[PDB]
C-alpha cells in the first residue's frame, strides 16, 4: 500500500 | 587465435544444450589459448551467472569490458547479473551504458524495460519494450513481457491478436525445445491449451535439472519406514515466504497445529528473517526451523534436508520469487508434493503430488497436471483469518432503516462497549441508535480525526490504523482498540448496492469487464468498487467501461490498504464479483472473512476454480455460476432481491465459522490424514498414484 508494502505472489 | 574461437563456439552450443559444466570448461580452455579473448570472458561470466556464481561472473564481465570498452553485450549481460544480485542502480548503469554504445541494441532496451517493470513503472517499461520490438520485431522475450505489462494495467488494445500472437510464439518455442517467453506463473492468463501450460512448466523444471546435474550427486536413499523417527512422519515445508507474505497469512498456524505424536515438522525457509511476527510464529512453533538462505549451495541444502530424514518434502513455491526448485530436482525425499503457494502444475517429474481437491482439480481434468492429484476432503485452500482477525468475528452497526454494511464497528472489546451504552437493539447484530454517542463517532469520521474516547473505550478511525498500531495494521498483532469502518471513508454510496473486487487489476480481462458492466446496467442503483492495484490501470478500466455504456461515477477506486484494513473494509460491500480468468485466492478468503458473498464462474485451470472450491466448502453453491449468463443473473439477483441478499449474507457470515473453510486445526488434521495416505502407499513400494 502507499506508505508501506503489500506483498503479492510474483514469478521468480 | 582461431583454436580459441572453436573452443568458444563449442562451449556456446554446450550451453545451449544445457551442459553447463562442459561449457565452463571449454570457455576456460579458450581463455588459456587466448587470454585477451573478450567474448570468451563474457560467455564464461554468463554460464557462471547461470550457476549462481555471481561474484565470479562479475569479475569476467569486467575483464571483457577492460579488453573491449565498447562491448555492449557485456554491459547488458553484466547488468543482468547485477539485477540478480539486487543491485538495481548498477544494472541501470550497465543497461543505459549498453544503449549509449549501441542505440539499436534491442536486448539492452528489453533489459532496461524489465527494470522499469520491476519497480512498477509500467508506462516506461511499455515504452522500452516497444523500442526493443521496433528494433527487433521477432523478439519473443520482449513481446511476452510487453503483453504482461499491458495485462497489469488493463491495456486491451488489439487484445485478441495479442492472445493469438502469444500462443503462436509459445507454440514455436515449444517445438524448438527452447524455454518459452511466457512465464509458467502467468500462463493461466492466456488462452494456451492445457498441454502448452503443462509444457511451459516442464521446460522450467528442466532448467533446474540442468543446474544440479553439474553437481554429480548420486541418488539419495530414502527412509522406507518410520523407525528412526520414533513412529513419526517427517514433513518438511520449503518456502521463501516465511514472513510478511500471503503464504504466511494463510498457513502460519499449520506447523504448530501438527500432532507431535505422529508428525515431526521441519520448516526450511529459503528467505532470511524479515523481522515480522509471521516469521517469529513459524520459527517458534515448528519442531525444527532451518534457514536455508544461509546455505546458498543447493547441493549442501539438499544434503541438509536429506539428513533430517524427511519423508514428505512440500514445495510451497513452484515457479515464484525465491523458489529453489533445484532442491526438489535433487529428490532428497521419497515423497515430494506441491502444496499451496503455486496455483498451477510444476510440470516437473521430481514433483510427485499436487495437494488440491475435487472442486479445484476434478479428475476429468487431471491432464493439466504432471503430478498425481492428492485431494483434501473439502478445499485445499486455507486462511489464518480466524487467528489474525478475530476482532472481525463479530460486528455492530449504527442506525444513522437498518443496514449491516454502512457504519460498522469491530473490536475484541466490542461487547463491553455495547454493554456500556444505554439503548442497543439486537437483530444477531447489535444496533446502536443515533444518540449523542452515535454522532461523536460519525463526527470523528467526517472530521478525519484519528480516534476518540467513549465511556473510556478507545474508538479508532479505520483509516488511521498504521498511526494507532502499525503491527495491527499489517496483521502481525490483533487490534486492541475498537475500529469504526464506514462507506463514507471510501466515497461509497449509502443508498445503493456495492459490488467489489479487491484483486490486482491484471486478473480482469475484456470479457470480465463486460460481464460486470452488464450487471451494473441491470442494477441501476449500484457501483463497482476496485483498487488502484496499480493506479496506472485506473484510466484504462474507466475508458473500457465508458465504451461499454458505463458512467465514470459507477466505478469507485480506492488505494491498496494495509492488510487488516483491507480485510475489515470488505464488510462495506454487498457482493464480491470474482475474476474468472484467475480468481481471488488469498483475496477470496479475505472477502469471505468479512461475510461478503462472492459470485464466481469456475473455468478449467486450477487458478480459475479456487474461488468456487472455497464457496463449496463454505457451502454456498448458489454463488457458483456455470456460464456468464448465470454469473450476471446471480449478481443481479443479489443486487435487487434484497431479502435474498440478506439471507445469503447471513449464511456467509455464519458459515465462515461453522464450515471448515477457516478451521486451521481441522485442515491440519485432514492434511495429516492425506500425508499418511501418501506415505503408506509408498511404504508398500508403490509409486505415486492419485489419492482420492
Ligand atoms: C492468477 C494468479 C493468482 C495467484 O498468484 N494466487 C496466489 C495463491 O495461489 C497463493 O496461495 C497465495 C500465496 O500463498 S498468493 C496468491 O493469491 P491471490 O488471491 O492472487 O493474492 P495476491 O494478488 O497474490 O496478493 C494480494 C494480497 O494483498 C493483500 N491486500 C490486497 C488489497 C489491499 O488493499 N490490501 C492488502 O493487504 C491480500 O490480503 C492479499 O495478501
Q: How much helix, strand and coil, in percent to the nearest 5, is found in chain A?
A: 0, 10, 90
DSSP category for residue B219: P
Query: How many Å apart are CA B109 and CA B130, to the nearest integer?
Result: 9
Mutate to test the pocket of ligand 1, among B253, B560, B585 (most ligand atoms within 8 A of CB): B585
Beta-carbon contacts of residue B647 (< 8 Å; ≥ 6 apart): none
Closest chain B residue to the Cα of A9, Cα to Cα: B320
Mutate to test the pocket of ligand 1, among B342, B360, B571, B586 (most ligand atoms within 8 A of CB): B586
What resolution in angstroms does the PDB record give? Answer: 2.5
Task: State how far the alpha carbon of B562 is from the alpha carbons of A2, B56, B63, B473, B506, in Å.
Answer: 9, 41, 47, 6, 20
CATH superfamily label, B497-666: Glycogen Phosphorylase B; (3.40.50.2000)
Query: How many Å apart are CA B150 and CA B72, to the nearest integer?
Result: 29
Which residues in chain A touch residue B185, judged by CB atoms under 8 angstroms apart?
Answer: 9-12
B351 lines ligand 1 (CB under 6 A): no
CB-based contact B175:B203 (threshold 8 Å): no
Q: If you take atom 27 of ligand 1, which residue's CA is the nearest one?
A: A8
User: Could you give phi then psi for residue B390, rounded to 5 degrees?
Assistant: -70, -25
**Residue of B459, B404, B398 lying closest to B428 (CA atoms):** B404
User: Could you give phi then psi for residue B356, rounded to 5 degrees?
Assistant: -140, -145
Would the CB atoms of B185 and A1 count as touching at under 8 Å?
no
Q: Residue B688's Cα: distance from chain center in Å?
A: 27
**Which atom, in ligand 1's list, is nearest to the CA of B507?**
1
Query: How many Å apart are CA B472 and CA B388, to the nearest integer?
Result: 9
Out of B186, B322, B562, the one facing A4 most closely (by C-beta) is B562
Query: How many Å apart are CA B692 and CA B440, to the nearest integer?
Result: 57
Beta strands in B156-297 (DSSP E): 233-239, 263-269, 288-291
Given CATH 2.30.30.30, say whether it is the number of domain B227-384+667-684.
no
**Residue of B431, B436, B437, B481 lying closest to B459 (CA atoms):** B481
User: Could you give phi then psi for residue B596, rounded to 5 degrees?
Assistant: -100, 120
Chain gaps in chain A, named by the residue before each (C–N > 2.5 Å): none
DSSP category for residue B423: -
Beta strands in B262-367 (DSSP E): 263-269, 288-291, 312-315, 335-338, 353-357
Cis peptide before B217 (omega within 30 of 0): no
DSSP category for residue B402: -
Judge residue B49's burial from the number of C-beta atoms within 10 Å of its C-beta, 0-12 exposed, 13-18 middle, 19 or more buried. Answer: buried
DSSP category for residue B624: B
Task: State how far the alpha carbon of B398 is from the alpha carbons of B403, B435, B442, B540, in Å.
Answer: 8, 10, 9, 37
Q: Is B424 left (phi over 0), alpha (psi -120 to 50) or beta?
A: beta
Which residues in chain A touch residue B582, judged by CB atoms under 8 angstroms apart?
Answer: none
Query: How many Å apart are CA B474 and CA B476, to the nearest integer?
Result: 6
**Which stretches of B68-191 are DSSP H helices?**
72-84, 88-101, 106-118, 122-135, 140-153, 159-175
- The catalytic residues of B are 185
Beta-carbon contacts of residue B190 (< 8 Å; ≥ 6 apart): B147, B163, B166, B167, B182
Query: How many Å apart are CA B409 and CA B419, to the nearest integer?
Result: 14
CB-based contact B254:B383 (threshold 8 Å): no
**Residue of B158, B85, B147 lying closest to B113 (CA atoms):** B147
Out of A2, A5, A12, the one facing B320 most closely (by C-beta) is A12
Task: State how far the alpha carbon of B408 is from the alpha carbons of B411, B427, B488, B594, in Å.
Answer: 10, 14, 11, 11
Experimental method: X-ray
Give the closest-approach CA distance of A10 to chain B in angstroms. Answer: 6
Class of the CATH-defined domain B385-490: alpha beta
Amino acid at each position: 500500500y502507499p506508505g508501506g508494502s503489500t506483498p503479492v505472489s510474483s514469478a521468480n | 587465435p582461431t583454436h580459441a574461437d572453436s573452443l568458444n563456439n563449442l562451449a556456446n552450443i554446450k550451453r545451449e544444450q544445457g551442459n553447463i559444466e562442459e561449457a565452463v570448461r571449454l570457455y576456460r580452455k579458450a581463455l588459456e589459448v587466448f587470454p585477451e579473448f573478450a567474448a570468451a570472458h563474457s560467455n564464461l561470466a554468463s554460464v557462471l551467472q547461470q550457476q549462481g556464481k555471481l561474484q565470479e561472473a562479475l569479475m569476467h564481465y569486467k575483464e571483457a569490458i577492460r579488453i573491449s570498452p565498447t562491448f555492449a553485450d557485456a554491459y547488458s549481460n553484466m547488468g543482468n547479473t547485477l539485477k540478480e544480485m539486487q543491485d538495481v542502480q548498477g544494472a541501470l548503469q550497465c543497461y543505459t551504458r549498453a544503449i549509449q554504445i549501441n542505440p539499436a541494441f534491442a536486448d539492452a532496451h528489453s533489459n532496461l524495460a524489465s527494470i522499469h517493470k520491476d519497480s512498477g513503472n509500467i508506462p516506461e517499461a511499455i515504452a522500452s519494450y516497444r523500442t526493443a520490438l521496433k528494433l527487433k520485431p521477432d523478439f519473443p522475450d520482449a513481446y511476452c513481457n510487453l503483453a504482461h505489462c499491458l495485462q497489469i494495467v488493463c491495456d486491451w488494445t488489439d487484445y485478441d491478436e495479442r492472445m493469438k500472437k502469444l500462443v503462436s510464439i509459445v507454440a514455436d518455442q515449444l517445438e524448438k525445445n527452447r524455454l518459452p517467453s511466457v512465464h509458467p506463473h502467468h500462463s493461466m492468463l492466456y488462452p494456451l491449451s492445457h498441454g502448452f501450460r503443462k509444457a511451459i512448466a516442464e521446460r522450467h523444471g528442466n532448467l533446474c535439472l540442468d543446474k544440479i546435474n553439474v553437481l554429480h550427486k548420486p541418488p539419495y536413499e530414502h527412509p522406507k519406514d518410520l523407525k528412526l523417527s520414533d513412529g513419526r512422519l517427517r514433513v518438511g515445508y520449503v518456502s521463501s515466504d516465511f514472513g510478511n507474505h500471503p503464504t504466511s497469512h494463510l498457513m502460519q498456524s499449520i506447523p504448530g497445529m501438527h500432532n507431535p505424536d505422529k508428525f515431526e515438522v521441519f520448516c526450511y525457509a529459503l528467505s532470511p528473517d524479515d523481522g515480522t511476527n509471521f516469521r517469529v510464529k513459524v520459527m517458534a512453533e515448528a519442531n525444527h526451523f532451518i534457514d536455508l538462505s544461509q546455505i546458498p549451495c543447493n547441493g549442501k541444502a539438499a544434503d541438509r534436508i536429506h539428513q533430517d530424514g524427511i519423508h514428505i518434502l512440500v514445495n510451497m513455491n513452484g515457479y515464484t520469487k525465491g523458489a529453489r526448485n533445484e532442491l526438489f530436482a535433487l529428490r532428497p525425499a521419497p515423497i515430494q508434493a506441491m502444496w499451496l503457494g503455486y496455483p498451477g502444475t510444476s510440470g516437473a517429474l521430481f514433483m510427485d503430488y499436487i495437494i488440491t481437491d475435487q472442486e479445484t482439480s476434478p479428475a476429468e481434468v487431471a491432464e493439466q497436471y504432471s503430478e498425481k492429484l492428492a485431494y483434501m476432503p473439502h478445499t485445499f485452500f486455507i486462511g489464518d483469518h480466524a487467528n489474525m482477525f478475530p476482532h472481525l468475528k463479530k460486528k455492530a452497526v449504527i442506525d444513522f432503516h437498518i443496514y449491516d454494511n454502512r457504519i460498522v464497528l469491530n473490536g475484541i472489546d466490542l461487547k463491553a462497549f455495547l454493554d456500556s451504552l444505554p439503548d442497543v437493539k439486537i437483530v444477531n447484530m447489535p444496533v446502536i441508535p443515533m444518540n449523542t454517542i452515535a454522532e461523536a463517532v460519525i463526527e470523528m469520521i467526517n472530521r478525519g480525526q484519528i480516534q476518540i474516547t467513549i465511556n473510556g473505550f478507545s474508538i479508532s478511525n479505520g483509516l488511521a490504523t498504521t498511526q494507532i498500531n502499525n503491527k495491527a495494521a499489517t496483521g502481525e498483532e490483533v487490534p486492541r482498540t475498537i475500529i469504526v469502518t464506514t462507506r463514507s471513508q471510501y466515497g461509497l454510496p449509502e443508498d445503493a448496492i456495492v459490488y467489489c473486487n479487491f484483486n490486482q487489476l491484471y486478473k480482469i480481462d475484456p470479457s470480465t469487464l463486460q460481464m460486470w458492466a452488464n450487471i451494473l446496467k441491470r442494477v441501476p442503483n449500484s457501483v463497482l468498487w476496485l483498487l488502484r492495484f496499480p493506479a496506472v490501470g485506473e484510466p484504462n478500466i474507466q475508458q473500457y467501461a465508458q465504451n461499454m455504456g458505463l458512467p465514470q461515477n459507477r466505478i469507485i477506486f480506492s488505494p491498496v490498504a494495509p492488510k487488516e484494513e483491507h480485510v475489515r473494509r470488505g464488510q462495506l460491500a454487498d457482493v464480491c464479483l470474482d475474476t474468472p480468468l484467475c480468481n481471488g485466492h488469498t483475496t477470496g478468503m479475505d472477502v469471505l472473512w468479512a461475510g461478503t458473498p462472492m459470485v464466481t464462474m469456475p473455468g478449467e485451470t486450477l487458478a480459475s476454480r479456487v474461488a468456487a472450491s472455497q464457496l463449496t466448502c463454505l457451502g454456498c453453491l448458489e454463488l457458483i455460476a456455470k456460464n456468464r449468463q448465470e454469473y450476471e443473473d446471480i449478481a443481479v439477483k443479489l443486487g435487487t432481491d434484497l431479502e435474498y441478499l440478506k439471507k445469503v449474507r447471513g449464511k456467509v457470515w455464519k458459515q465462515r465459522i461453522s464450515s471448515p473453510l477457516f478451521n486451521t486445526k481441522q485442515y491440519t488434521m485432514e492434511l495429516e490424514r492425506l500425508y499418511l495416505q501418501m506415505w503408506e502407499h509408498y511404504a508398500a513400494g508403490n509409486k505415486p498414484d492419485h489419492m482420492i
